[PDB]
């Protein structure tokens, strides 16, 4: 069979364009030859199994490599002074100067220092040795196999689920909430009280004896009665030493609040109590919708009920709109997953749950930067598939006059306003920055415009941070909120008022401007993506755009010119802005924490209000150790990052080629090369099986953006790690 098998249109393409476009369309199952709706879902369902197995096979990889080539057993003896190892290094191109550099972390051979923070995670959950790790790698190896066989099984005729089975939203929700979320949470609470909490108190519990040692002196007697107070009997003391019995208690379910004083992380007894409480409220949550017993709701029925005088038809037929369109479903999922992924980033740097991780500055920097980038991708994609929905699945008849339709009905008002807010932020936020630069540059920094984050400062005050002295709610000992009373509060108030962690960092003028620069970035990225979706079906410049689909090169140079006019081109443009937003964002987090970790917060506080300060103090100054990874004198452990740094700058700039110079130049240049080949003697016997052509108009946009993105993260990643690993 001629590749691609799924598109006869592409298979006939006599040019090289066949190969590329075959790869770019392999996963758009909807556009395949003779694809039905039932066979679509069944193919997605099987594909999902194969994806899960790749995940478990990846974690097994880290678990196995830590156990095999890592110093995990030595690291748990002194997690504050030993560097955790990622994996071994096997490179025949290494020279003497290089082998001596990467021989580090006490290892006798060349290794890499791990920055994923998995050491801290494994340790905290009760991993003690390289035998539990390895045993963990194998279990996730057979679990993966479990799913790879399942996907194979459900493609067999006897097991193929019906289309009615995939469209059953009621039953999928009841199970995902009560089972996948609830029981899973209840099962982690079980692990925490059985393994993590005990093994943190020196008492080993594992597959050997767990079935014959209770996690508490009492044994489920207070539970089935109503005296749950006993499980919060004797907490771990302030002087508890993690890993040993010195200061350990007996409580399993506490609500202490704040951090463990040694490990500077949340109390396992709080973490345990958390997943227990959440489990319950998730199980009852999975009883909402109707199944085979009359009780429950129809989402359809309750959705159709919410209509009011100002929104016309309300939410009528929205059940079917969603349940019929996967791009709609995929959009909500990506949008939501992308927000909480940000929430993960924001909560894991300010409220660590892993012992001794708040001391590992590099991992804390990587893990935050990492998850924000992931979050940024998810948000673009959410809007991307949002636009695709309007192009391929939206039905104006069933959706007539409801809230979805009315978005389009006043799409002008939305886009123009979103455009104003962006212009509003952009003109002024840049305005103050450039005022300050000039003002400072003329030796008069006292003339700067420095606005106090009163609103954000006031927010901290309401949670008990008395530094600003607003005296409100929790920073008010007389308030009703402080006398509520007690429970978590003493631990929490101590946590928030020690300027020793990253819990509600003190904020000033520097923080005021960056947040507004960030707001510019969220509005503009949303301006692009939302416009790309609302105008996906048509504009005055192209009223029949929907007939052309989501992605297409353009509509010729007629009617003024129509370059980058498709919804796909709105995603492509938006990507540049999301990267930009993350840049400002991650720049902010890093430069501010560098000050924290140095006890020198005065640097960011006093120089972040003008942009030369960012350029001078953050970018130029912290590149010092990075760019010296290698030089005419020697080579140190930062050699890679130095080399990767350039590699990043290179890829980035190679992207400008595919982005600035467009096709026609290259199609002509190729023809001369094709001429040269056919005219060169001896080299004529070799005839290509595929006619060489220049990349397509869309292809070059995509490729150019891919370089730009790979260059963007690899460059910064090499800077974040090296600068923080060097300076600590």
């Amino acid at each position: 069979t001629k590749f691609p098998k799924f598109s006869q249109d592409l298979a006939q393409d006599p040019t090289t364009r066949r190969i590329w476009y075959g790869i770019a369309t392999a996963h758009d199952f909807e556009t395949h030859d003779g694809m039905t709706e039932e066979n679509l879902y069944q193919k997605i369902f099987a594909s999902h199994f194969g994806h899960i197995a790749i995940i478990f096979l990846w974690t097994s990889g880290t678990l196995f490599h830590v156990a095999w080539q890592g110093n995990f057993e030595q690291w748990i003896k002194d997690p504050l002074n030993i560097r955790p190892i990622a994996h071994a290094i096997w490179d025949p191109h290494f020279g003497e100067g290089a082998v001596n550099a990467f021989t580090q972390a006490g290892a006798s051979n060349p290794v890499n220092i791990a920055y994923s923070g998995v050491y801290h995670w494994f340790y905290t959950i009760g991993m003690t040795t390289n035998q539990e790790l390895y045993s963990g790698a194998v279990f996730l190896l057979v679990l993966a196999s479990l799913f790879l066989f399942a996907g194979w099984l459900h493609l067999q005729p006897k097991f193929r689920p019906s289309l009615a089975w995939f469209k059953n939203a009621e039953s999928r929700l009841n199970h995902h909430l009560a089972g996948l979320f609830g029981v899973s949470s209840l099962a982690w609470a079980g692990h925490l009280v059985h393994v993590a909490i005990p093994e943190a108190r020196g008492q080993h519990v594992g597959w050997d004896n767990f079935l014959s040692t209770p996690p508490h002196p009492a044994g489920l007697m207070p539970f089935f009665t109503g005296n749950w107070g006993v499980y919060a009997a004797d907490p771990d003391t302030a002087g508890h030493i993690f890993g040993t019995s010195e200061g350990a208690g007996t409580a399993i379910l506490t609500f202490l609040g704040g951090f463990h004083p040694q490990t500077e992380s949340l109390w396992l007894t709080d973490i345990a109590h958390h997943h227990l409480a959440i489990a319950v409220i998730f199980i009852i949550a999975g009883h909402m919708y109707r199944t085979n017993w009359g009780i429950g709701h129809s989402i359809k029925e309750i959705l159709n009920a919410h209509k009011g005088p100002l929104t016309g038809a309300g939410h009528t037929n929205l059940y079917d709109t969603i349940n019929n369109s996967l791009h709609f479903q995929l959009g909500l999922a990506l949008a939501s997953l992308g927000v909480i992924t940000s929430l993960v980033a924001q909560h894991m740097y300010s409220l660590p749950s892993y012992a001794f991780i708040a001391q590992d500055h590099t991992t804390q920097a990587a893990l935050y930067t990492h998850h924000q980038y992931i979050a940024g991708f998810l948000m673009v994609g959410a809007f991307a598939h949002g636009a695709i929905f309007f192009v391929r699945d939206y039905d104006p008849v069933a959706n007539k006059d409801n809230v979805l339709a009315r978005m389009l009905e006043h799409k002008e008002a939305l886009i123009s306003h979103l455009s104003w807010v962006s212009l509003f932020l952009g003109f002024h936020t840049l305005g103050l920055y450039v005022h300050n630069d000039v003002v400072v540059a003329f030796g008069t920094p006292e003339k700067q415009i420095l606005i106090e984050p009163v609103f954000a400062q006031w927010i901290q005050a309401t949670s008990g941070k008395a530094l600003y002295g607003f005296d409100v709610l929790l920073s008010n000992p007389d308030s009703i909120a402080s006398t509520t009373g007690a429970a978590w509060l003493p631990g929490w108030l101590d946590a928030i008022n020690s300027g020793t962690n990253s819990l509600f960092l003190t904020i000033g003028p520097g923080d005021f401007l960056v947040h507004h620069a960030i707001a510019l970035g969220l509005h503009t990225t949303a301006l692009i993506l939302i416009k790309g979706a609302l105008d996906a079906r048509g504009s005055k410049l192209m009223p029949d755009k929907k007939d052309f689909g989501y992605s297409f090169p353009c509509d010729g140079p007629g009617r003024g010119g129509t370059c980058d006019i498709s919804a796909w081109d709105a995603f492509y443009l938006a990507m540049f802005w999301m990267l930009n937003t993350l840049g400002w964002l991650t720049f902010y987090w890093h430069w501010k924490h560098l000050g924290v970790w140095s006890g020198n917060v005065a640097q960011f506080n006093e120089n972040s209000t003008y942009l030369m300060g960012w350029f001078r103090d953050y970018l130029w100054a912290n590149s010092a150790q990075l760019i010296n990874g290698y030089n005419p004198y020697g080579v140190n452990n930062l050699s890679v990052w130095a080399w990767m740094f350039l590699f990043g700058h290179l890829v980035w700039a190679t992207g400008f080629m595919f982005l600035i110079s467009w096709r026609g130049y290259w199609q002509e240049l190729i023809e001369t090369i094709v001429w040269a080949h056919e005219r060169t003697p001896l080299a004529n016997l070799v005839r290509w099986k595929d006619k060489p052509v220049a990349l397509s108009i869309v292809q070059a946009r995509l490729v150019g953006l891919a370089h730009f993105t790979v260059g963007y993260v690899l460059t910064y990643a090499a800077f974040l790690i090296a600068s923080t690993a060097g300076k600590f």
Binding site: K5, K43, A46, S47, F49, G50, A53, L57, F64, A67, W68, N130, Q131, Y134, A137, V138, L141, V142, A144, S145, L148, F149, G151, W152, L155
Partner: peptide, 30 residues
Amino acid sequence: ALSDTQILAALVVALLPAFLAFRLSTELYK
């Protein structure tokens, strides 16, 4: 023999997820 021969065996049981990835791959292809 905890982490000595443990490099082996682990490779043997790794043939299963590989082989089952190959059977799933040919079915998704069709």
